[PDB]
Amino acid sequence: PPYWKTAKEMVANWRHHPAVVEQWSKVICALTSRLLRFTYGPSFPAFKVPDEDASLIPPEMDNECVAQTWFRFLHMLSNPVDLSNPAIISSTPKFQEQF
Amino acid sequence: GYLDLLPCRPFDTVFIFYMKPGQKTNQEILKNVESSRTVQPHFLEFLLSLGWSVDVGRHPGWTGHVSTSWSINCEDIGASIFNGQ
Amino acid sequence: LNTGLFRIKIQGATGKFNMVIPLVDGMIVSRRALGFLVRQTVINICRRK
Amino acid sequence: EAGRAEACGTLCRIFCSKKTGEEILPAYLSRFYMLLIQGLQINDYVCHPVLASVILNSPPLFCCDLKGIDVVVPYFISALETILPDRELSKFKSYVNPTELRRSSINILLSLLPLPHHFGTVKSEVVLEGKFSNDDSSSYDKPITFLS
Amino acid sequence: EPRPLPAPRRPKVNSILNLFGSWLFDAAFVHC
Amino acid sequence: FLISSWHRDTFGPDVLDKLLENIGHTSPECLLPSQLNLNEPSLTPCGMNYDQEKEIIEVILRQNAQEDEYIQSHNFD
């Protein structure tokens, strides 16, 4: 968990780069597709996902371990509402040093 | 007789079914109708607002089934009386 | 519904001339004009068929 | 505006998918009703993308027998008066397809016609928390009946 | 583009609101 | 036909939750910093104050009660 906390603290300072949110969206879509693939069953409609994004995650992960990493990656980025506020984004320690 | 049995105006037929939650088999759907006092009264009110009631034997016109139609020669059961017999 | 009004959904009533007017898909009708509208829709559908 | 529009795209769509006879926590309903009231404004606080998204995403909104949904009825009536009479919808043509928007508006309107004759003289509560009401009849502190 | 009917096995609306609606509500109202 | 003693007038009288609770019980660290709880509803949105929500909820309840009373009473009309 300390590494998770450090990553979450560090990743919050890179939200001004457009690639970060796109990669986070792709990875969370892949994780949630993998989760719902077994959470309900084959009866539930399957979430469409690109082949490469599904290939980012390896198939060795057991069913139990998927939920924890899915939740942790869903909350990995800060509240997306924060992106709406321009002052909050322009308040990182590097930005303050830049200020 | 062939000429007599030919009607002069178009005729149609309408079937009515009742559904309860958690029903997927045809037998249960047919079964829920024949019971009385087990359905909403609004269903009966809607039924009686479609048309009058005529006995199949004495009906001189279309009755929904060929074998008992155009016969010119004249305790609760629910909405199963209108089953066509 | 719980408010007394009725909700209507019709399946397989689309042909060359689109759909039938007297009772369109996703319509709301009060109890007063329910039987009359249902009968009119049946008549129109049979005539179209 | 794009993010705000997508926000109730998602929200507006979530509530319309409720199962029949399913209880919803009243706090969520209150928040959703407040969002709907805020979105449907025409006087000065009008935003075309969010209004179009709210109209388009929730056709069966009134048909899902939401508890207390009838409060926001006058706001929807006021909103529709500025879209249906329009000929080509120049303002909304750069955000959504005009034909689909017109279809959604027709679906919304057609789900409200029985309400007057069904209710008639029954009063409708008004929530006056500021300059939210669009009417200028100086009757804000008066429950409007469906006859008008 | 038509939208498919919701699956009969979908979770309750309150659970979806608990899981996601907070972000959705905040995002809607912040630009409101 | 008016059938006697037959008509309306005559007649008279979650797996997602399990997953969320399992994650919450097996991982207290990933919980929100007191802002949100998994099972419990989240806090009020930033755009609306608590008093406005308290007014809206009672307005909605009164609307529903009034409509139900009107529908039940005016049935015989």
Do residues F14 and E15 make contact, with C-beta atoms less than 8 angstroms apart?
yes
D139 Cβ contact list (under 8 Å, min separation 6): none
**B6 DSSP 8-state letter:** S
C-alpha distance across the termini of chain D, in Å? 34
Residues of D in contact with E19 (CB under 8 A): none
The alpha-carbon gap from E19 to the nearest alpha carbon of chain A, in Å, equals 10
Do residues A25 and A1 make contact, with C-beta atoms less than 8 angstroms apart?
no
Do residues A61 and F41 make contact, with C-beta atoms less than 8 angstroms apart?
no
What's the rounded Cα separation, in Å, for the pair A9 and F33?
Answer: 14
Experimental method: cryo-EM
* Residues ending a continuous segment of chain F before a break (C–N > 2.5 Å): 13
Do residues D82 and D38 make contact, with C-beta atoms less than 8 angstroms apart?
no
* Residues 8-27 of chain F whose Cβ lies under 8 A from any Cβ of chain B: 8, 11
D102 Cβ contact list (under 8 Å, min separation 6): D83, D84, D89
Do residues D35 and D27 make contact, with C-beta atoms less than 8 angstroms apart?
no
F42/A contact by beta carbon, under 8 A: no
Q: Helix, strand, coil % (nearest 5) of chain C?
A: 30, 15, 55
In degrees and rounded to multiples of 5, residue F28 shows phi and psi of -65, -20
* Residues 66-125 of chain D whose Cβ lies under 8 A from any Cβ of chain F: 67-68, 70-71, 119, 122-125
Nearest to F25 by CA among A63, B39, B83, A71: A71
Do residues C13 and C45 make contact, with C-beta atoms less than 8 angstroms apart?
yes
Do residues E18 and F39 make contact, with C-beta atoms less than 8 angstroms apart?
yes
Cβ-nearest to C29 among D60, D62, D114: D114
Do residues D31 and D55 make contact, with C-beta atoms less than 8 angstroms apart?
no
Runs of H (alpha helix) within F10-77: 15-26, 50-73
CA–chain centroid gap for A84, Å, is 18
Using the CB atoms, write b or e for D68-92: b if 16+ within 10 Å: bbbbbbbbbbbbbeebeeeeebeeb
3-state SS class at C29:
strand
Name the resolution in angstroms. 3.8
At position A30, the amino acid (one-letter code) is A
Using only the alpha carbons of chain A, give its radius of gyration.
Answer: 16
B84 Cβ contact list (under 8 Å, min separation 6): B56, B63, B64, B65, B68
Structural tokens at position B49: 């607002």
What's the rounded Cα separation, in Å, for the pair D31 and D29?
Answer: 5
Residues of C in contact with F71 (CB under 8 A): 3-4
| CB neighbourhood size of F38 (10 A) | 19
3-state SS class at C14:
coil
Locus of tokens 């409060």: D71
C42/D contact by beta carbon, under 8 A: no
In degrees and rounded to multiples of 5, residue C28 shows phi and psi of -125, 125
What's the rounded Cα separation, in Å, for the pair D35 and D41?
Answer: 11
At position F21, the amino acid (one-letter code) is E
Tell me the angle at which helices E22-31 and D2-15 cross, rounded to the nearest 10 degrees. Answer: 140
